[PDB]
Amino acid sequence: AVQKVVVHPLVLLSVVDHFNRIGKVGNQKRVVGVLLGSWQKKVLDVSNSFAVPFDEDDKDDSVWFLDHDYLENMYGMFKKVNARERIVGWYHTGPKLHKNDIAINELMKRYCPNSVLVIIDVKPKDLGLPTEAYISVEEVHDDGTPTSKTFEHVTSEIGAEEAEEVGVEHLLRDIKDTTVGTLSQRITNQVHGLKGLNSKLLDIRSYLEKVATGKLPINHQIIYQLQDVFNLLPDVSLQEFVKAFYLKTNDQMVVVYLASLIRSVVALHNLINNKIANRDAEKKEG
Amino acid sequence: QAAELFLDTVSTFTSYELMDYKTFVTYTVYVSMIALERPDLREKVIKGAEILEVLHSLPAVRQYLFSLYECRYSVFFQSLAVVEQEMKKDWLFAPHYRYYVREMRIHAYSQLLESYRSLTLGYMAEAFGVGVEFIDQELSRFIAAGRLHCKIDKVNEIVETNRPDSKNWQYQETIKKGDLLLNRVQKLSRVINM
Amino acid sequence: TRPANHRQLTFEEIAKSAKITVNEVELLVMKALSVGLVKGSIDEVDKRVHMTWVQPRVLDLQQIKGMKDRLEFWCTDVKSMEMLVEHQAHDILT
Amino acid sequence: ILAPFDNEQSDLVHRISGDKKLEEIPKYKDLLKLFTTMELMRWSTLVEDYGMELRKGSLESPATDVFGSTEEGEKRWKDLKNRVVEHNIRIMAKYYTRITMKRMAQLLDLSVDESEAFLSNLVVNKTIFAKVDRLAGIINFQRPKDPNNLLNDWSQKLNSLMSLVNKTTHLIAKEEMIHNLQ
Amino acid sequence: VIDAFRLINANMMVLGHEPRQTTSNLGHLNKPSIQALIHGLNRHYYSITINYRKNELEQKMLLNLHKKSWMEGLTLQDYSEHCKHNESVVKEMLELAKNYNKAVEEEDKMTPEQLAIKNVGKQDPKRHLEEHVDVLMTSNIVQCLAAMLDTVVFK
């Protein structure tokens, strides 16, 4: 269907503004709006947005109010100043997706059947990206319904255009990593990867405890995939693996050796040049 | 390097430094015995008629080369002894005339051991030269040097062979040349800067 | 039944556990492989087989506790390695 | 069936199979169903269940062509023999790893010398890889292992594991969302 | 390049006055460009200084630009192309090393004043060499560290 989505930063700043802007008006926990973008092949590119008035009461899961014609004619207004953009989705800023949300989608799907849901977390505490992307599918299973209706995951990333990137780079005066290179190649990576993996395993355990007891609506598919995951882990101890690993590292070291040798001899030549350029010039002051 | 630069057997005039074109031919065949292996030997120094016609007038060198090619090891050694005796008193070969010899002999061994795998050493006596103890000590001192990869057992008088990969040898020379260059550069480092 | 290691097994053990003569087990395992419920390989001259993957099954609240345990004392290793590396290279980008 | 195996045949059989009218002749239906699937009966049952049906019905004229002419009939029978023995070799090399000489010779219903003489021209044509030993009667497939491959597949398994463990969490989250949100 | 302007009435110069009575240094910290001053500028309109209103929250969430997935940090870079890249680079190191000592021998036989010109037409071995050492070391270090971390963190 659709394979990945790329989000421009301008929508991030717009959403961050909108959240506080509504914070003025009322005690609303959440806000909602329309995402505009374009397509290339299986890839979606999203670039501009505007907010739409929305209301909900926690009285119950079935009492909420979204206004039609505001969106209807606002999209007309935007069309009349840039023809390239089409309505292509909607966003909200809840920390996790809510129970209403699928019934929300069935409203606005009329405007674009491919419509996708993007979550933008407004308050980061963590090293994952703030975005998420979800697309609706029916799924078949043995019993309980012919099909359920389910959100499923599409991969998302932030991108930038030629000139908005200049704009953002003007603003980030206050911090940068000292040097790109091997220290960035590590500290910007491995430690972050390990932290992410640890947090994933923590969430797995947190669910598994509330399945050993608690509410425990056991779902067998989880157990199936977990069986796969545990089966997949390799035996490192095998002799024929060890001999290969040594036969590779014992090769990789030679290149580091040679390169360090060359580096040393070049630095030596540089020292020789400096010293002879000094002893033949210092004498001129008598 | 000599054998590569001595492949000018069609452009060497009756020069003033080697009175004999035949002496030039003898020198080039002598060095080509060591430098190059069997395909090139069999392809260049035996298929080039310009030197075959000259060698036709030099029976000793002809039989010396043919003995090594045809695996007649019995006649090889007398010719080798004659050659090394002659080159001991010759100029620009004396300073290392022994070295040369100690190559050819070991080379002969490497020309026979790789065809078979469990050859008895008794066969050498009637095929390479009489004397069991002589061959025994020769093989022992050649194994100890790190060349001619094989092994010998005395209780049953047998000789086995092995096939080391072409990696360990490609490693020792690397490590030792690295050591010497590092030593030299350290000496350079301290000799400068007081 | 077997552990995840050590799951090589021999013809005669199948022949006993299926009470079929040895000479059929080859065609039995061929059948099993052909419908994709088990994945592996066979060695006829050793008379042994090396199974490597098997279809999942349903399992109960007693089995999952082992999952919980192995997950906990797996995660401890990740935590240890993180706490090691972020110390040993402290200076290179503090 | 007579054509040697190739991609063109392997997908042409797929295209021509599953035709609605073809069910009116279940015999040849079973023929191509047999040759589409895995390891197949050696030689006896096929000829015993199909060697006589090639004269009845109202469509046996190509069957008579396979039978009538002496040279044509003999050649086509020989070619069918070769096709089935080749299919057996292909599938066993797909599944087996190392096997004795006599076992597969028996599974080919013909002598050991004929077996090796028949697979020799196969291996020299670079279509099936095997290194048979004529001293202990042990033959194998199993191409030698290269260092780059071992740990490369190890890294591939790591990639799959990471992808799966990443995909689990979203499903877990949508599981909690429909029960403990209110 | 952003700027802000406002008009001024010519009445004030008819009186001989000038606009923008001044009490502070902080207006004069910048100079207009010649191109801006050829056009009207001070004889018709005057500029105002600008600054950028910020808050920490939007900064805290904007710097996520070009952050990447954790999994990307643990990939092993296709062990089959790695060696090909390595012993491709080594070849040009060979062909450069054989060209270094000529430029070492010519170090002093000519006037140094023109030595700069000796560079301009023709690449020099010394500077062009060491970037290969940089590449080789940067790659081969991390390729080796990642394998160890993997061979400990999984089973």
The answer to whether residues A110 and A173 belong to one domain is yes
SS3 labels along D147-165: HHHHHHHHHHHHHHHHHHH
Length of chain C: 94
The HSE-up count of residue E141 (CA atoms within 13 Å, CB side) is: 13
Phi, psi values for residue B105, rounded to 5°: -55, -55
The answer to whether residues A96 and A16 belong to one domain is yes
Å between A164 CA and nearest CA of chain E: 12
Q: What is the DSSP letter of D145?
A: P
Please give the residue of chain E at the shortest CA–CA distance from A190.
Answer: E73
Judge whether C23 is closer than 8 Å to chain D, CB to CB.
Answer: no
Q: How far is CA E137 from the centre of its chain?
A: 23
In a domain, A195, yes or no: no
Q: Are E126 and A267 in contact (CB under 8 A)?
A: no
User: Do C and B make contact, counting contact as 3+ CB pairs within 8 angstroms?
Assistant: no
Q: Could you tell me how many CB contacts below 8 A there are between chain D and chain E?
A: 23
Nearest to C67 among A197, A198, A208 (CB): A208
Query: Which residues of chain A have a CB within 8 Å of the CB of E60?
Result: 124
- Tell me which residues of chain A, numbers 243 to 262, contact chain E at a CB-CB cutoff of 8 Å: 245, 248-249, 251-252, 255-256, 258-260, 262
Crossing angle, helix B169-191 and helix A239-282, to 10 degrees? 20
CB atoms E153 and C85 under 8 Å: no
Q: Are C24 and C32 in contact (CB under 8 A)?
A: no
Nearest Cα residue to D119 out of D106, D109, D129, D134: D129
A44 CB neighbour count, 10 Å cutoff? 24
Which residues lie closer than 8 Å to E47 by C-beta, 6 or more apart? E3, E4, E5, E32, E41
Nearest Cα residue to D2 out of D60, D51, D73, D58: D73
C-alpha to C-alpha distances, A263 to A269, B163, C92, E105, nearest whole angstrom: 10, 38, 21, 20
Which residues lie closer than 8 Å to A149 by C-beta, 6 or more apart? A102, A136, A137, A138
Distance (Å, whole) CA A63 – CA A60: 6
Nearest to C42 among D38, D97, D138 (CB): D97
User: Do D and A make contact, counting contact as 3+ CB pairs within 8 angstroms?
Assistant: yes
Per-residue burial over D16-51, b if 16 or more Cβ lie within 10 Å, else e, is eeeeeeeeeeeeeeeebebeeeebeeebeebeeeee
B170 CB neighbour count, 10 Å cutoff? 9
Sign of CA dihedral A13, A14, A16, A17: positive
Distance (Å, whole) CA D180 – CA E11: 74
The residues that bridge with C11 in the sheet, in sequence order, are none
Nearest to A190 among C59, C79, C85 (CB): C85
C-alpha to C-alpha distances, C36 to B21, C44, C81, D53, nearest whole angstrom: 80, 20, 38, 34
Nearest Cα residue to E74 out of C83, A252, A193, A232: A193
Q: Are B106 and B139 in contact (CB under 8 A)?
A: no
Distance (Å, whole) CA C49 – CA C43: 6
**H or E element: which one contains B125?**
helix B122-127
What distance, in Å, lies between the first and last C-alpha atoms of chain D?
64
CB atoms D99 and C46 under 8 Å: no
What distance, in Å, lies between the first and last C-alpha atoms of chain E?
57
The answer to whether residues A110 and A237 belong to one domain is no
Sign of CA dihedral A34, A39, A44, A48: negative
Distance (Å, whole) CA A18 – CA A22: 6
Nearest Cα residue to A35 out of A89, A114, A101: A89
Distance (Å, whole) CA B11 – CA B5: 12
Residue bearing tokens 């290392």 = B96
The answer to whether residues A22 and A76 belong to one domain is yes
A110: exposed, middle or buried (C-beta count within 10 Å: 0-12, 13-18, 19+)? Answer: exposed
The answer to whether residues A161 and A263 belong to one domain is no
Alpha-helical segments (H) within chain D: 7-16, 26-36, 44-50, 61-67, 70-95, 101-107, 112-124, 147-177
A146: exposed, middle or buried (C-beta count within 10 Å: 0-12, 13-18, 19+)? Answer: exposed
User: Do B and D make contact, counting contact as 3+ CB pairs within 8 angstroms?
Assistant: no
Judge whether B115 is closer than 8 Å to chain A, CB to CB.
Answer: no
CB atoms D166 and E154 under 8 Å: no
Query: A248: domain range?
Result: 223-282
The residues that bridge with A40 in the sheet, in sequence order, are A43
Distance (Å, whole) CA B160 – CA B153: 8
Contacting chains of B (3 CB pairs or more, <8 Å) are: A
The answer to whether residues A80 and A16 belong to one domain is yes
Distance (Å, whole) CA B149 – CA B162: 6
Q: Are C85 and A187 in contact (CB under 8 A)?
A: no
Nearest Cα residue to E36 out of E8, E4, E11: E4
Tell me the two tokens of residue A220: 């067998």
Tell me the two tokens of residue D50: 């199909």
In a domain, A175, yes or no: yes
Distance (Å, whole) CA D143 – CA D157: 21
Distance (Å, whole) CA D166 – CA A31: 28
**H or E element: which one contains B135?**
helix B132-144
Length of chain B: 194
Nearest to A268 among B174, B182, B188 (CB): B188
The total domain count for chain A is: 2
CB atoms A181 and E138 under 8 Å: yes
Q: Are E136 and A259 in contact (CB under 8 A)?
A: yes
The residues that bridge with B120 in the sheet, in sequence order, are B158
Residue bearing tokens 């599981």 = D175
**Strand order across the C38-43 sheet:** C8-10, C48-54, C38-43
Query: E107: domain range?
Result: 74-148
For strands D138-140 and D98-100, give the pairing: antiparallel
Alpha-helical segments (H) within chain C: 11-18, 25-34, 64-88
**Strand blocks (E) in B45-144:** none
C-alpha to C-alpha distances, B154 to A2, B124, B158, nearest whole angstrom: 77, 15, 7
Query: Which residues of chain E have a CB within 8 Å of the CB of A196?
Result: 70-71
The answer to whether residues A24 and A136 belong to one domain is yes
**H or E element: which one contains A158?**
strand A148-158
Query: Residue type for D4, please?
Result: P
A93: exposed, middle or buried (C-beta count within 10 Å: 0-12, 13-18, 19+)? Answer: buried
Distance (Å, whole) CA D33 – CA D17: 9
Collapsed DSSP state (helix, strand, coil) of residue A199: helix
CB atoms B192 and A275 under 8 Å: yes
Å between E34 CA and nearest CA of chain A: 25
Alpha-helical segments (H) within chain A: 9-25, 68-79, 101-108, 162-171, 182-187, 190-212, 220-232, 239-282
Distance (Å, whole) CA A222 – CA D172: 8
The residues that bridge with A4 in the sheet, in sequence order, are A43, A155
Alpha-helical segments (H) within A26-85: 68-79
What's this structure's resolution in Å? 3.6
Collapsed DSSP state (helix, strand, coil) of residue D70: helix
Distance (Å, whole) CA A77 – CA A85: 12
Which residues lie closer than 8 Å to D104 by C-beta, 6 or more apart? D92, D115, D139
Distance (Å, whole) CA A86 – CA A47: 11
The answer to whether residues A10 and A138 belong to one domain is yes
Length of chain D: 182
Distance (Å, whole) CA E72 – CA A193: 8
What distance, in Å, lies between the first and last C-alpha atoms of chain A?
84
The answer to whether residues A139 and A257 belong to one domain is no
Collapsed DSSP state (helix, strand, coil) of residue B56: coil
C-alpha to C-alpha distances, A181 to A187, A189, E10, E132, E135, nearest whole angstrom: 10, 12, 59, 14, 10
Cα angle: A53, vertex A56, A61; to 5 degrees: 145
Please give the residue of chain C at the shortest CA–CA distance from A185.
Answer: C93
The answer to whether residues A170 and A33 belong to one domain is yes
Distance (Å, whole) CA D105 – CA E121: 75
The answer to whether residues A232 and A159 belong to one domain is no
Query: Residue type for A99, please?
Result: K
Query: Which residues of chain E have a CB within 8 Å of the CB of C81?
Result: 149, 152-153
Sign of CA dihedral E15, E20, E23, E24: negative
Q: Are B103 and B34 in contact (CB under 8 A)?
A: yes
C-alpha to C-alpha distances, E68 to A198, D21, E1, E101, E150, nearest whole angstrom: 17, 57, 32, 45, 19
**H or E element: which one contains A117?**
strand A116-120
Cα angle: B51, vertex B56, B58; to 5 degrees: 95
Put residue A68 in one of left, alpha, beta given phi > 0 → left and psi -120 to 50 → alpha. Answer: alpha
The residues that bridge with A225 in the sheet, in sequence order, are none
Distance (Å, whole) CA E36 – CA E33: 5
Collapsed DSSP state (helix, strand, coil) of residue D104: helix
Nearest to D98 among C27, C34, C45 (CB): C45
CB atoms C78 and A201 under 8 Å: yes
The last residue of one of the domains, among A182, A208, A235, is A182
CB atoms E152 and C81 under 8 Å: yes
SS3 labels along chain E: CCCCEEECCCHHHHCCCCCCCCCCCCCCCCCCCHHHHHCCHHHCEEECCCCCCCCHHHHHHHCCCCCCCHHHHCCCCCHHHHHHHHHHHHHHHHHHHHHHHHHHHCCCCCCHHHHHHHHHCCCCHHHHHHHHHHHHHHHHHHHHHHHHHHHHHCC
Judge whether D158 is closer than 8 Å to chain C, CB to CB.
Answer: no
In a domain, A277, yes or no: yes
For strands E5-7 and E45-47, give the pairing: antiparallel
Distance (Å, whole) CA B138 – CA B129: 12
Which of C35, C38, C45, C46 to substitute to test the interface with D, most D CBs within 10 Å?
C45
Å between E25 CA and nearest CA of chain A: 26
Contacting chains of D (3 CB pairs or more, <8 Å) are: A, C, E
Helices (H) and strands (E) in chain C, counts: 3, 3
Nearest Cα residue to A208 out of E67, B50, D176: D176
Nearest Cα residue to D142 out of D134, D153, D132: D132
Tell me the two tokens of residue E37: 């001053």
Query: Which residues of chain B have a CB within 8 Å of the CB of A264?
Result: 185
Structural Rg of chain D based on CA atoms? 24
Judge whether C45 is closer than 8 Å to chain D, CB to CB.
Answer: yes
Cα angle: B149, vertex B155, B156; to 5 degrees: 75
Collapsed DSSP state (helix, strand, coil) of residue D141: coil
Tell me the two tokens of residue C84: 């090691």
Judge whether A247 is closer than 8 Å to chain D, CB to CB.
Answer: yes
